[PDB]
A paper describes a structure:
Previously, we identified DNA aptamers for the specific recognition of Plasmodium lactate dehydrogenase (pLDH) for the diagnosis of malaria disease in human blood samples via impedance measurements and colorimetry. The dissociation constants of the DNA aptamer pL1 for the recognition of P. vivax lactate dehydrogenase (PvLDH) and P. falciparum LDH (PfLDH) were found to be 16.8 nM and 38.7 nM, respectively. In this study, we determined high-resolution structures of the pL1:PvLDH complex and apo-PvLDH by X-ray crystallography in order to understand novel ssDNA structural elements, ssDNA folding and interface features for specific pLDH recognition. pL1 folds into a hairpin-bulge contact by adopting three novel structural elements defined as a T-loop-like motif, base–phosphate (BPh) zipper and DNA G·G metal ion zipper. Therefore, pL1 recognises PvLDH predominantly via shape complementarity between inflexible regions and many bridging water molecules (bridging waters).
Residue numbers in the entry:
A (entry chain A), B (entry chain A), C (entry chain A), D (entry chain A): 4 to 82, 95 to 316
C-alpha cells in the first residue's frame, strides 16, 4: 500500500487526509510539530474508511521517523521577507529527514512562497530534480477555469487555462491559452457569450482569490487540498496528467537554477516532461517578472 | 440538479460540502447565522469542482429563503440540560422555514442531543415521519466496525455491527449482532483471533470516542460528515441502504411518540422501512435505558 | 430513480448496461425485438449490482410499453443506401412509442448513418429539438485524443480535439483545434515531440478505426458504449459538459433543417447550447462536404 | 503501473478489460490463442480511457512472453469429465509460462471446473499457495444476495451470504449465514417480510442461474467479470476484503491437498487469511459432498 506523509496537519492537511481515504489512495501519516492534534484528526479520519469502502491507515505523528518509506511527501508546514529564514530552517530539517528516510519519495511543497521554498527543500534534501515540485498552477487555474465556466454555463473541467511563472500576485494569466471544450476563448468573446471586460474582471478575481476568501472570514484549504491530491494521484497511479506546477528550470524560458510554474507531466517516475510554452514577447515579459520576484527572495537566504 | 442545504456551516458542514462536490451529488447551500464565513467556505469549495470533474454550485448564505426547493436539509446548527431550550428555539425557527420553503425535503438532524432534537424539528416542521431522521448509528457503528477491523486485519466495511437506542453515552452496542464478512464475531473469538476482553475494550473506546478525540486537541467532524453524506446519498440516489438512524417509533420496541436509533432503509421516498430488531430481554433492557434518557430530556422542553 | 431504456440490446447495449450499473446511474431496460436475449443479459448484469455497491434494476424486454416514463432513451436498433428505408421504418415505430410513452425523454441515436437517422427519429417522435442528439464526435474524437496521447505520453483526457460535420468517412478532423493540456498541438510539432506526418497518419487511423477493428476479427462496442454513457450522464446529472454530437442545425454553419456534428453543451434540460465553431474557409469546405453527404442520404427517404 | 494479464479474451475477458479501464487499475494484456481477436478488442477498449479519465494501456496478444512482470494473471482460457485432460494440458502450458515469466503474480483461475483447475495450475506453476485462487463464491453469492435484496427491497450489497465447498451444482448455500444490514435473515422470516419457501426458491434459482441465463439465449459474463475484478482489486489495492474463493485447504474443514470454496482475506500479499467456518454437522455434510466431487474429478487426471 502506498504511503503518503503529510508534513503539516493543518486545515489543508485535514482535507488531504479526507480525500486520500475517499480515493483509497494510500496509508496516511498526518505529521505535525503540534502535539496531539494530528493524532486526533487521524483518529477521526480513520473511521471514514467505513463509509468510503476504503482501507487506508490514518495515523498522527510528531515523530519524524514516520517519514520512513514514504512514497509521497506533502509539505505544508511553515510560519513577509522576514519569514524566509524561519521557513528555510524548517526546510533544512525536513530535508535531512527526507534524505535519510525516504530519498525516493515524490515531494510536493506548499509552504509559501512556494517557488522559493520548493527550491530550498530540493537543495536541503538532495532528491532528484524530477522528484520535487511546488503547488501553484493547478490551484490558481482552478479559480480561473471555475469563474469562466460559470460565465459560460459549462462544466468547470471543460475550461482549460494556463497560469505560469510563480504562485502569488505576479502569477501570469495567459489569455491566449484559455479554451472551452477545446475551443479558443476568443470565439466565445466574438459570439458575445462573454466579454473582454468580464475576462479581465475574472483575471483580477483569480489573482486576488486568497485575499477574497480571507476577507470573507475564512481561508482557502479545500481547493488547495484537492489540487495537491490531483498532483499526488497522478504520480501514484502513473496517470501522466499535464499539470502546471513549480519545477526546476534547466534552460526553459531562458532560465536556470530557479523553480518556476510551468505545465509538466506527472507520472510514475515523477516529472516525466517539462513543457516549455512558446510564449510571445509580452507573455515572456510577464513570466520573467514573476520569476524575477522568486529570484529576489531566493537571493535573501 | 438536487439541492442540498447545510443549515450550519461549521467543520462538519465544511467536510459535507467537500464530499458533495467530490461525489457530484447536488448543488450546495452552506447556510449559517455567522456572517461571511459560509460565503468564504463556499467560494473555496466551489473551485474544487475542477479537480473533481463535477458541476455543483456551492454558495454561502445567511438568508433562510435559500432553503427554497431543497431536496435535502442537514441541520448541524445549535449551541447540558440547560441547552435544551436554546436549541429548541433554533428548531422552532428552522422548522417554520422548512414548512414554508421545502416541505418535501428529506431532513437529517445532527444537533445534540440528536434523538431529542430530531423529534423537536419533526414537531416544529410538520414534515412526514418518513422524511426526517437523526444521525447516530452510522457514525457510532463506524467506530466499532473500524476498531474490530483493525484487530482482525480486514477491510473496515466488511465488519457489520448495530448500535441502537440513542446517540450518546447510553448507546447500545449489540455484541450478538457483530459479523465479519457475514460471519458471527463469536467464531473469531472461538478461533482466538480476538478476545472477549479486546471486544469489551473496543466497546468502551467506541462509546467514548468523541471524548478521546476532544482530549487529543481536536474534535470529530470528518467521520460525522461522511456518515451524514452516506445517509443523504442513499436518499438522493434511491440506494435503499440499511442504515441505523434515529426515527419515530410507532410501536417498535414497545415504544411510541419518541425517536430512537434503529436500523432502517433509506430510499428515494425517505424512510422506506423501519427494522425492528428481535432483541432479547437483556438487550431490550439496555435499549429501554437509552430511550428513557431521551424521554427524560424531551419532557424538559 | 432515473430510468434508462436501451432500444437495442446488442454488444453496445450490453456494455452500456454494465456501465450504468457501475455508475449507479439509473434503472435499465434492455429492450430488443429478439426474444429472450435481453432478459438473459439483464439477469446477468443485475447481479453485478452487488460488486458495484449499486442499486439499479436491470430488466429485459421485447415489449415497447417499457418505454413508459423513460428519462433517457438510447437507440442502437437497426439493420448501403438500401438500408435507409428499412431503418427509417424502425425509426417510425420507435418514434410513435416515444411520443406516446416518454415524450419528455432525452434521446440519443446511434443507428447508422447516425446523422440521417437522428433527424428521422426527431421527425417521427415529435420531441423538442433540444432533446434528441446523435452519437458521433465523442466517439471519433476519443480515437484521435487517444492516439495523440500515446505519441506524446500524456493522459488521454488531456488531449482535446474536435471532429465535426458527420460521423463516418467524411468526418472533419480539425487540426487547428487540437490541444494538449490546453496547449496548441502546433507547439509540440515545433518542439519535435510529434511530426505533421505522424498527425496525418493518426488522422487516417481515426477515420478508418471501425474498419481496423472489424478487420481484426472484432467490432467496436466498448468505446461507443462509453461515449454514449458520457453523454447520457451529462444529461442525468446536469454536468453541462461540452460534447461533440449530432444536433439540428438552425442557421449554424449556414445550414438549416439538417443534423450535423458540432460541439454542444448537454445539461439537465437537454442541449443547452449549440456551439458554432468559427471555421476558416478550408475547414468550412470540409464541413459542408460532410453535411452534404447527410443531405444526399436524407433526400432518398 | 500494475500489469494485469487476461489469459483468455472471450466475453468475460472483454468485460474485465472494460472494468479495469473504468477503475484505472492497471495496464491490461488481453491474451488469447485466437489470432487478431484480442488485438481488436484491446484497440476498442483502449479508446474508452478518454471517457474514463484513465490511463491504462490495453494491448492484445497471442504471445505468451507478454506475461512478463504481470502483477495479476486471470485465467479464463479453456475448452464433461472428458474435458479434464484437455484443460489440464492448457494449465500445464500456462503454468510453465507463469513460473518463467511472472512467478510473483497473483493468479485467479476461472476455467471450469474451477476447484479442480485452480489446483492443477497451482501444481503446474509452482506459485505459493497464498498467491493462487479460484473464482466461485463471490459470483455465486452475488446471485443469492441480489435475489434476497429484491425480495426485501434493500441495497443488494447489504445482504451478506456465504456459499462454500465448490463452484457448481453442489455449491453449499448456508442459510444460517445470511444477514441483511447485519441482521439475521431469520428475523425477516419471523416478521413475515420473506418466507422460508421464498428463500428455498431463491436457493434453487441461485444454484441454477448459469442454466437460466444460458436458456435465455445468453450466457453469464458480466457478473463473473465483476466478481473477478473485485478479487483482483482487493489484491492490487491491499483492501483485505473478505471474499469467498477457492483456496488450498491445509487442515481446514478436516481436508488437505484439495482446493475448496471458503471465506478468505485478499490483501497485498495475496491470501492473508483463510477463514474456517464453524459449520454444524449437517452443513459440514454438504461441504464434504461438494469437495468430494472436486476430489473425484481431480483423481481422474
Amino acid at each position: 500500500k502506498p504511503k503518503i506523509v503529510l508534513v503539516g496537519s493543518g486545515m489543508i492537511g485535514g482535507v488531504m487526509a479526507t480525500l486520500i481515504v475517499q480515493k483509497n489512495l494510500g496509508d496516511v501519516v498526518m505529521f505535525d510539530v503540534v502535539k496531539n492534534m494530528p493524532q486526533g484528526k487521524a483518529l477521526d479520519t480513520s473511521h471514514s474508511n467505513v463509509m468510503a469502502y476504503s482501507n487506508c491507515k490514518v495515523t498522527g505523528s510528531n515523530s519524524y521517523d514516520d517519514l520512513k518509506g514514504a512514497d509521497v511527501v506533502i509539505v505544508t508546514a511553515g510560519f513577509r521577507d522576514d519569514l524566509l529564514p524561519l521557513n528555510n530552517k524548517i526546510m533544512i530539517e525536513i530535508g535531512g529527514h527526507i534524505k535519510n528516510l525516504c530519498p525516493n519519495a515524490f515531494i510536493i511543497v506548499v509552504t509559501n512562497p512556494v517557488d522559493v521554498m520548493v527550491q530550498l527543500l530540493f537543495e536541503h534534501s538532495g532528491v532528484p530534480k524530477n522528484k520535487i515540485i511546488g503547488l501553484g498552477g493547478v490551484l490558481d487555474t482552478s479559480r480561473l477555469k471555475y469563474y469562466i465556466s460559470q460565465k459560460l454555463n459549462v462544466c468547470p473541467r471543460d475550461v482549460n487555462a494556463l497560469i505560469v511563472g510563480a504562485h502569488g500576485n505576479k502569477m501570469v494569466l495567459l489569455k491566449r491559452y484559455i479554451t472551452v471544450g477545446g475551443i479558443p476563448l476568443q470565439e466565445f468573446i466574438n459570439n458575445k457569450k462573454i466579454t473582454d471586460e468580464e475576462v479581465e474582471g475574472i483575471f483580477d478575481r483569480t489573482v486576488n482569490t486568497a485575499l477574497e476568501i480571507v476577507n470573507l472570514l475564512a481561508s482557502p484549504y479545500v481547493a488547495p487540498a484537492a489540487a495537491i491530491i490531483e498532483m499526488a494521484e497522478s504520480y501514484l497511479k502513473d496517470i501522466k496528467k499535464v499539470l502546471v506546477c513549480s519545477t526546476l528550470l534547466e534552460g526553459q524560458y531562458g532560465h536556470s537554477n530557479i523553480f518556476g510554474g510551468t505545465p509538466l507531466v506527472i507520472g510514475g517516475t515523477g516529472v516525466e516532461q517539462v513543457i516549455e510554452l512558446q510564449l510571445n514577447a509580452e507573455e515572456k515579459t510577464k513570466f520573467d517578472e514573476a520569476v524575477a520576484e522568486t529570484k529576489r527572495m531566493k537571493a535573501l537566504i
